[PDB]
Design a protein around this ligand. Sequence first.
Ligand code: FE
Ligand code: FE
Ligand code: FE
Ligand code: FE
Lengths: 350, 350, 350, 350
Amino acid sequence: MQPKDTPELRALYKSFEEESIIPLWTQLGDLMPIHPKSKAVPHVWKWSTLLRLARKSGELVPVGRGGERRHLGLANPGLGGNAYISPTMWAGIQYLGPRETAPEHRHSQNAFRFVVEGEGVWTVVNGDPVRMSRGDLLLTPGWCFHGHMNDTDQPMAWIDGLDIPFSQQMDVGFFEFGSTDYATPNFSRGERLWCHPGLRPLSGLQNTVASPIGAYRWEFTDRALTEQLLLEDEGQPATVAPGHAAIRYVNPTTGGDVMPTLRCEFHRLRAGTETATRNEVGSTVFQVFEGAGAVVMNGETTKLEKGDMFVVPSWVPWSLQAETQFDLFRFSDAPIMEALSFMRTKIEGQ
Amino acid sequence: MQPKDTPELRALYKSFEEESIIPLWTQLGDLMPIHPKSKAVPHVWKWSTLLRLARKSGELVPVGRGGERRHLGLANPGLGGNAYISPTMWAGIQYLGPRETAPEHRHSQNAFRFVVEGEGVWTVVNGDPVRMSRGDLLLTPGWCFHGHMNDTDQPMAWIDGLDIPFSQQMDVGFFEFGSTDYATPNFSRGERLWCHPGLRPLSGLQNTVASPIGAYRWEFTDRALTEQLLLEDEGQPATVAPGHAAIRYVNPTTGGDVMPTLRCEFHRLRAGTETATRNEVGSTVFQVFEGAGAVVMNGETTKLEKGDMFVVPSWVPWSLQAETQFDLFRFSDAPIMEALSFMRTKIEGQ
Amino acid sequence: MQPKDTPELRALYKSFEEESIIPLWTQLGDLMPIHPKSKAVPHVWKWSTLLRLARKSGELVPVGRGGERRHLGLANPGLGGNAYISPTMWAGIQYLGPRETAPEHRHSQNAFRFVVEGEGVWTVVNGDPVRMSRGDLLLTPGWCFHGHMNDTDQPMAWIDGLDIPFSQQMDVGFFEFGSTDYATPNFSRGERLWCHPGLRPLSGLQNTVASPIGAYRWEFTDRALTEQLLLEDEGQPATVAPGHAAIRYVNPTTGGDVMPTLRCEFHRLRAGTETATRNEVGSTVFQVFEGAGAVVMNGETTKLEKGDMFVVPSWVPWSLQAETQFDLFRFSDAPIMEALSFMRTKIEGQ
Amino acid sequence: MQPKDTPELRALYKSFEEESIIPLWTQLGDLMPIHPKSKAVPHVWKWSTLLRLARKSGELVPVGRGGERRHLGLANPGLGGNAYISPTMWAGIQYLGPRETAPEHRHSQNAFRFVVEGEGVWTVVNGDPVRMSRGDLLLTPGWCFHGHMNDTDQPMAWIDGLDIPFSQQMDVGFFEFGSTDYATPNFSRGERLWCHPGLRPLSGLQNTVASPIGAYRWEFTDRALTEQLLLEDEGQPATVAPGHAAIRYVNPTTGGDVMPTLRCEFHRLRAGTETATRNEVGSTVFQVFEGAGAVVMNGETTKLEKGDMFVVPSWVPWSLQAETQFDLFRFSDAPIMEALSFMRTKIEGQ
Ligand SMILES: [Fe+3]
Ligand SMILES: [Fe+3]
Ligand SMILES: [Fe+3]
Ligand SMILES: [Fe+3]
């Protein structure tokens, strides 16, 4: 940068290039930033748009000519043309047509399916068939064989969230093909063993790295958030903040996050609730499941409508405001920040 | 023992007594036994008897003259006149009369209440009122204020299980008095936050030493064991052994045992099921909740009838045989053996 | 207690005896004490005495007539004639004569050896020979084969601390006989792999329930306490309290206590140091390794001299005062209180 | 990819671009690879070269014109012009001149200093001054204030290893400036409290996310590897493989890795030792501290000489061969792979 630009210097630099050495002193860029400054940028996708483009994708791309991958990837404008919503996460709308199937495969990358629209599709996870409907969270944890069948003439839309960008950058990717029955049970084996509150099968005493619950069904989510707002009505502690009910989807063998790499939550805000501004390390994505409100990011307010999705990159100040009762599904890379002692939180309140 | 019995020896022994020294060589007894040989002995209490003596206790002992402690302690014949069912555990039948109450207190010793007969009594745990009915497990973990009220003209019987003998021998006992409302909610606050499968309130992210679930209600227990036998019907893994469904009551923040000192389980055996003989370190107590069968202990078969209770001391070989569908509530000191690396298991199968 | 003493009552009580039921209401004793009130009592043993009785035991009890168990057990006056220093722990002076040996055995009960006087005895733990000298702590953890040989014509005295009383009361005891070489290496294999600060063999990546270090040698203990007093001289944080250096013997795979059931520590107090009074749950034993001071227990001061030993039962208020530089080896049942969430501390300071 | 290229398609694609959607079906690249296929490539840097360019950097770049950052970054040829040795790690040669200093700063990114050449430089970590010499490992864990002073007229070379590339990609970076004494103690406070084998200060009972040992000095490393080869001579288990001694630098409060994000090890291979080929997930860097041998990567053998450094990206098959006694310092991103359940190992042996 500032050494004397002499012949002997330029010879040194020439030698550098040759030996693949880069010297610190010529480096100008933001080495060790004061706080995180992501290349990802806050962004909002409108459901009215995504749904439109999804339905058209249904007409224009059949099985045999791309229909197998009929998946609308959400790309952050800041991430150089990659189909990545944040630096750690991949989120896409999977638009599954009438009677459509996918064979089984397995990969190291962890993944979930959040059903936004439809019913009567089964994702068959290690042979265990897990039914899908609006508001269910399905897990297909890393190295679990998974495939699916649509048992109906209606299509389905779901959010596919994966840890692809993390796994790509970090070199951890593995993949295998599997290989019929097409069973359609109302509840999977996993749910039948693990979905009884406070009870654990004697046959499942070993803890697991990922939840053995195949589906976190809408019924239960909805009940939990209602009780929290009800307890608040009654003077009882329940909500994380006034008007703000919320649960964390957990692995019951452990009480921890669903998968090693991804946290999932569900938030219910009472009409007129306005959350305190947060800065949190790493990235998160919300989908507005029901109701109307707005989000503030970097001081910019965006009005939000049913089905809209948005991303908050690392350290971006954010808050939500409910106009009506505001329901949002949430996911993030937080289990990574926390496993590695990188997590840090600033709340405007405290 | 074998030193030469001389004047100088007897002088040494005299000096020993004076200095409170006991020399190893004169010690004869079973110092370090080959395997555990408990002073507690296997034993069975008949419900037809206990109920009889309980009902009479109701007539003969009113409030003001012992009725406050109307509690039939189960004493092991081997434990020198102590009201202790095993060396680690206290189990008693509490016979609560019409409209009877108890003020709040708190103690370090951990405790549970398993309802055998009745309904409509509330145990109010740290202010949170927890309703009681047949087949519910209630926890009153150590240092939680607890008291109760019977909201009815009918009596109630429950098993009171505590870690009293452990806590007495080990010197850990603490106790405080509390000090009205008498609320009668259908479900407690604890249940309302924690009894939704796979979901955890954002307001309860901290793990706990004991379960925050106040009641493990019968409904859920019954469903879990039915699904396990059903999965077995269907070729699916579920049961711990052929015909033998079983759950472990767990603390959901952790996936571990209900309380640091006590494990609780519930077993359902299909008619004609006969379990493999087990030797397990430490003690356990079963109550036959429903059905008919037998237990073998030390090779002795005892026929078992609805409501009967029995104890298996450390290392006693035991097995159960179901005549009808055989339901049993179970508890033990195993979390102690396991925390300290003393647990050891022998199964006749393997 | 207070029910009307009628014929029908006495019939009930008669039935109780017969069915081995004890009713709560007739129970008078201290059920659930306000704080711990141990049957064990504070006590001090004088070394000048123990040594005297130990040396005489050497003359009067040879191999063939008790010499194999030439062990002076320290019995608490409060514990009904048992050779138990507290309700959880066994502590004894082992007086090993010239050239004396013991074959290998193994037991579930955990144990340590603290060398007070002598050198050149090896305790051979799972085949690994561990040399012994004044101030060394040796572990023989549960289920490790152990035996010893005295390679010299001098005798040796050590403290044998075990978890016998706990294991007896709780029914966890197991025992086996083993079955030559008599090797005398300066340091054992364990020490050679594990006694290099901050370094862990790639061949020992698995954690262990008990420390793999066979001996915690005096050299190292002495250095650690000296540095702590030196840092204090220098204005640096180090001591737990002014004038009070102390280390905890730890299992290096874990950073935790030496064995699941026993904590060992070493304390060095600067002349004139006077510790704040503590109440701590469970029991502890100190031995005065070097120097002079006193101990206060229940408000009673006992002057203390080199080699003296004392016991503080659960919840007894205690403090030490150094006259000279005061060195003390310490052990306790605390890892038990802590594993089970029974531990509680009161310090006069705070 | 394969949908019919019609006007209506191109309109859909146009809409995609506008809404920042990327559709899966047009994606061609290696989405979910069969096994890891890093952009980083195996590479070797020669010390004779690095030292040459380092010494010249000393002449050509003084304080005031880059000398403050006189640091030769090792850039992987595969990583697009970034000064990153692997996708997760930053490794550089810091060439510190006569009497040169650096003020204190702190950052979230974790870091170590491995001294290759020189003595008598102190890195002052949170005020605690830690001396540096050949073969010492120094830690400056995340959020610890650190700076340094050279107390001599000789220069020093060290390896600076950081988790910069991980922290950059993942958005976790934080940074602060500090702000004299220039003390030169032989050992730091950290070492004085924590470098006594098997002993833990009572003032440090709390576990830590990173090791409190400031320096892992050469003496101790060297002793551990010598004992391991000696035990092998003697028929005792010690080495991880025949001829192959190795330790892992550990955090003593925990027994775990030095820092949350970086593993450090030291390997000593007996002459003629040839390791089994390994595939391991994530990246590692070795420096040849002493001796001569070779490394095989992807089947290509590179002869290796004292001070040479090399990188093995994720899943690259590798092995080392010792010609003489071969000593190597090693580091990796493995604690990340392991915290997140991404680690996987293939050894040619098994
Ligand atoms: Fe997939
Ligand atoms: Fe009570
Ligand atoms: Fe022994
Ligand atoms: Fe730095």
